[PDB]
Design a protein around this ligand. Structure first.
Ligand SMILES: O=c1cc(-c2ccc(O)c(O)c2)oc2c(O)c(O)ccc12
Length: 125
């Protein structure tokens, strides 16, 4: 069964736009999105569709790039570090739910390397 997906708006949470957050959307997310391994990570895990009834029994902080994209578009984040933490949660969820050597883990490992490559240098404010 599926829990509600992570929020992408929250009226009482303070919003912010920075050069780094704009970069995280325009270059980091939108480039990763096009990678041949991006497809599993473009939407919340649908445990009913994918037949993973234990996914949310194991993963208590779900995250995916579709949620991240919507948060960036909505200026949901205060700073770039908050957004980077969501990417890191997404990758670690994959490693936690699975095991070394699985096809999905190989995909996450490749995407994490590309992600780190792109966040190594960010614009200045
Ligand atoms: O973490 C994941 C794990 C799996 C997965 C699927 C079938 C299996 O037999 C298995 O052992 C693991 O599938 C995913 C997926 O399809 C996504 O879109 C995003 C994340 C995952």
């Amino acid at each position: 069964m599926n829990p509600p997906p992570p929020e992408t708006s929250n009226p009482n949470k303070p919003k912010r736009q920075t050069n780094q957050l704009q970069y995280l959307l325009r270059v980091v997310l939108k480039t990763l999105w096009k990678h041949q391994f991006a497809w599993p990570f473009q939407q919340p895990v649908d445990a009913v569709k994918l037949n993973l009834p234990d996914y949310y029994k194991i993963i208590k902080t779900p995250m995916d790039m579709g949620t991240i994209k919507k948060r960036l578009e909505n200026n949901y984040y205060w700073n770039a570090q908050e957004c980077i933490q969501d990417f890191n949660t997404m990758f670690t969820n994959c490693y936690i739910y699975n095991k070394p050597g699985d096809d999905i883990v190989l995909m996450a490992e490749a995407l994490e390397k590309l992600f780190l490559q792109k966040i190594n240098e960010l614009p200045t404010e």
